[model samples]
Target: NLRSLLVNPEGPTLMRLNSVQSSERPLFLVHPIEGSTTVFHSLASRLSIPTYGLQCTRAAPLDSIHSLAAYYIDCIRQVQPEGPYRVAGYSYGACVAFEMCSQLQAQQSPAPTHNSLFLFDGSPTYVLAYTGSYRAKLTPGCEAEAETEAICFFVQQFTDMEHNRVLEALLPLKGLEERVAAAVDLIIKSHQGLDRQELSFAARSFYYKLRAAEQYTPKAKYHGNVMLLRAAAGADYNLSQVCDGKVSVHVIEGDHATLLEGSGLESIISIIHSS
Candidate 1:
């Protein structure tokens, strides 16, 4: 009920990740492709300032990266309602955070000072290239079926189970809702307090996010400094190509998958603190 209360499909859902006494501008973290902010708990707790997470609404997901960025801008404004915000995103979220900072600069005019966009192993180039390669490999022509396969692909990656086996089990399923429901069952292993509706919402949310990522394209160059924390094994992303302002790149200890864990996470914290 608490989580359900914070998320709204019609608009933005802002959730506080941590609390701090400092009056400094709070850090806003955008959700990854999976559309949940739970992943940021560890990083948020490590940061000094108050932090908030913008989670995807799950219902009627937006298709474009710019539109989603606009949605997130509106969401963060509910808390800060001003300029000079610190925003960060991991994986797919990094793209969204960059767009958020760009939109802020455009509206505020003359650019705000101390405004920064922190990227956690994500870039538009990487996302677009990946989605492009992935879409080219899809077998079926149906967008809906492609979406189903995409969600399953992510589920396979997240669960580390055999990919073909999961597809074999899901192919016979009826529709998007049913297939996603089956995915929830496979993922959770137990109900875990998630009723049928919640399970469906989670699966569909992931599906829509993948769709959004596939459709997203960066429209303009970001004007402010980009603090890019790259995963050691992640794709080579050159933020300097898209950013007009300074691009600061730091390579952490772990790969993209492990970037937020252990030494990788510690490295990021240290970098943020020092910067």
Candidate 2:
């Protein structure tokens, strides 16, 4: 059976997905590159304040982080008041929202401050190959193997119906290229309840955003209230370092993908209560 999170019906939509009550302070969240705003469906239902979800634009071409994050802020500003803005996102979305926080923090005189910035297992990522030292840094025998396996794991999110389909798509690829494209293509077909072109666009967007995220690392520290909600078992890299000890690192019980969904959702709610 496909996991519930695997087939999210909601998604990379244009407007606010849901809200229980419009609060002076609103909650704006970023959708994961491969996922839709729909993943936040259950979370939005539980919150009383206006909850806004942003999907990557399939038509505009998400080429850079700055423009994309700016898109989210400018659009949300039309509805919300001029005050501290509460922002958060998961996975790659966290990176985009973080960029938003960084940009807001970077704002010069006469600029508004942020209410708070939160990240859920959002690690600053880049293709190791692009970095050009990934292979040299890893264990001698396991160089490219890890990346190959990573693609497989990503594909399995759709379903475990058949391992061969995932393997069939990747087994023939010799280079780092094409395997992910193949895997993403496989995922688009399996999501019965979601959109086809949206998912396809999302797959392409992931590459674009990932490139932006990897290349653009944070140089300045955020002076405002910024929080990093990390998955309990995390990559030792502890990407929270980018915050440079600016925010409190709260530990949730689950791993990267689990913290804000299912049983892990309760912990996230508690953190929101504190934030």
Shift in Å, residue 213, candidate 1: 1.4
- The alpha-carbon root-mean-square deviation between model 1 and the true structure, to one decimal in Å, is 4.0
Model 2: colliding residue pairs: 11-37, 11-38
Query: How high is each candidate's TM-score?
Result: 0.82, 0.70
The C-alpha lDDT values of all candidates are 0.74, 0.62
* C-alpha lDDT (0 to 100) for residue 267 of candidate 1: 89
Name the top TM-score candidate. Answer: 1
lDDT of 2 by residue, 1-275 (tens): 33333323343344675756644577888877564666677777777677887766653336677777777777667877465778888877877777777776776436656468877766455232233352343455652453444466556666554665665567568654576567656776676665554444444454555556656666565566667777632442245456654566777777766677877788777778776
* Model 2 quality (TM-score): 0.70
